[PDB]
């Protein structure tokens, strides 16, 4: 049943299944689910035909995802994965295939999450929704193929005169990035931060921060005795401050009529990328003006100059009222 797990791994898989079923500790069940999933991935990826199709840089190919699909069918939806596997031959999204990419994402989100068509469409048309959607494919088609699907959906969503692709960072973490010339924008800076979708549970951070704030008000001399107190409060304050600027930026564009659409976000990426072209360490700050039915908004950007001379967007900000 799990022909490519060692004897030890079969034992661990069974323990994970038991803890998943019997533990009254949600943290222990979450660990057990992760353990079950990691053992299943080792089983599938250790299939001899999966190895042949998925190794030496081919993990994102259609061949690789198709072999993994065959294996998963043998140890058991499959029509949603068929349209998805076919997208893995695509290298660039243009008018020929963009609707093929969109429909496969929509149809998959309906089958996988049980939502109706209109709800699936709204989910896949967002960066954060599409990240959840592609991530949910990884156990079946593999992480590299799921990552490629997220990039493909990004090229379709953000169609304009830049490309979208995935760039590794300092740790091997993928960042979906709009790229043009010698300039780069990690797209979450536009689609999340500029749209008021900064990470962090505002209400959780606010209560942890207000907790420390009252202690400092109650006895500042005592609070100051340990610099850990002021370290935690200042980091909470900054996180809260980033959310509040992120939400205020979103509302500035909102009130101007520049709402959260792919078209608007794509247009913003393209103008920012143009403004960065050929920049130098002399001036690392640029700005563009975008126009909506209710007025204009100036968007300020700061760029990091990378060692190879290209520019990567570091901060994006609007003004306020």
């Amino acid at each position: 049943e799990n022909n490519y797990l060692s004897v030890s791994e079969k034992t661990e898989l069974e323990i994970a299944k038991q803890k998943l079923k019997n533990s009254k500790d949600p943290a222990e069940r979450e660990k057990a689910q992760q353990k079950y999933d990691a053992l299943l991935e080792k089983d599938i990826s250790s299939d001899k035909a999966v190895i042949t199709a998925c190794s030496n840089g081919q993990a994102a190919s259609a061949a690789c995802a198709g072999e993994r699909l065959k294996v998963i069918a043998a140890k058991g939806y499959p029509d949603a994965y068929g349209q998805i596997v076919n997208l893995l031959n695509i290298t660039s999204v243009d008018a020929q295939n963009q609707q093929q990419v969109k429909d496969a994402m929509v149809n998959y989100a309906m089958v996988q999450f049980g939502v109706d068509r209109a709800t699936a469409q709204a989910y896949v048309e967002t960066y954060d929704g599409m990240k959840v959607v592609a991530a949910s494919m990884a156990p079946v088609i593999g992480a590299a193929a799921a990552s490629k699907i997220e990039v493909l959906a990004g090229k379709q969503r953000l169609s304009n005169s830049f490309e979208v692709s995935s760039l590794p960072d300092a740790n091997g973490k993928n960042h979906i990035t709009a790229v043009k010339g010698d300039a780069k924008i990690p797209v979450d800076k536009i689609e999340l931060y500029m749209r008021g979708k900064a990470s962090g549970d505002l209400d959780s951070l606010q209560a942890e921060y207000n907790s420390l704030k009252d202690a400092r008000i109650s006895s500042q001399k005592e609070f100051a005795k340990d610099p850990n107190n002021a370290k935690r409060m200042e980091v909470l304050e900054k996180q809260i401050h980033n959310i509040e600027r992120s939400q205020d930026m979103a509302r500035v564009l909102e009130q101007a009529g520049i709402v959260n659409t792919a078209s608007n976000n794509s247009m913003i990426m393209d103008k920012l990328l143009d403004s960065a072209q050929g920049a130098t360490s002399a001036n690392r700050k640029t700005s563009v003006v975008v126009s909506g039915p209710n007025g204009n908004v100036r968007i300020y950007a700061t760029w990091t100059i990378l060692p190879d001379g290209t520019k990567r967007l570091s901060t994006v900000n609007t003004g306020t009222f």
Binding site: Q220, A230, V235
Partner: protein, 153 residues
Amino acid sequence: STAKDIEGLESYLANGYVEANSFNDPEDDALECLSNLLVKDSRGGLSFCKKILNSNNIDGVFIKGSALNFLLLSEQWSYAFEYLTSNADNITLAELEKALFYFYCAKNETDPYPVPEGLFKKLMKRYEELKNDPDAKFYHLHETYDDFSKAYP
């Protein structure tokens, strides 16, 4: 392991980022490096609070408030009192709100430190200048100023 934190700081003052391949706001990376240093090594951590509090070549404004706040809550509080007395006309939004907040809390201390003359008027002068900066609300300046004045009428 603090020399790491010091080299992250040195790079922020030099190129405006902690490390090249970090996708964060470099001010946030630097705040972490500064607070990590202050807890592990005060003597060197307060030094970079000064190196931030005088640098006319730092992107972020928040981090200056962080640096000032860290000195006010340290044994070198007096370096911060004398910084606010002379630079009150030049201090940013973040510094002014951290100043107004420190003294609001100091109203509750048993043993408040000796406040230099006219400092409260210099702060209140600076507030009336920065009151109408649209960025004031992100520091909650009008609220912090309300507690500061209702603490010291």
